[PDB]
């Protein structure tokens, strides 16, 4: 007559996340007038038409 | 004075975005029992780290 119980438990967790985003854009316009030329950078047709 | 037309435009855009994430978890548990006809013993230990 003797009783013994023993338990050991271990849990481990590791989690790693990484995100990276990079953008580059370059636009150039020649001719017309420079003020309307800047308008094409909107990408909007009416402003492209105005240039 | 000589003036020349030069109507021109240039645009540049550079952008960078970054996320980094690290996570850790640790859990531990211990349970012990002792027995004798006129004695009983119990021990518990629990540990958690985040």
Numbering used by the authors:
A (entry chain E): 233 to 283
B (entry chain F): 82 to 131
Sentences from the paper on this structure:
Mpf2Ba1 is a 53.2 kDa protein isolated from Pseudomonas monteilii through a multi-step purification process informed by artificial diet bioactivity screening against WCR larvae. The protein is comprised of two domains—an N-terminal MACPF domain and a C-terminal β-prism domain. Pore-forming proteins (PFPs) are a major class of soluble proteins that oligomerize into rings and undergo large irreversible conformational changes to become transmembrane assemblies and breach the membrane of target cells. We have identified and characterized the non-Bt insecticidal protein Mpf2Ba1, providing mechanistic details for how it effectively kills the devastating maize pest WCR by forming pores in midgut membranes targeting a different binding site than the insecticidal proteins currently deployed in commercial transgenic maize hybrids.
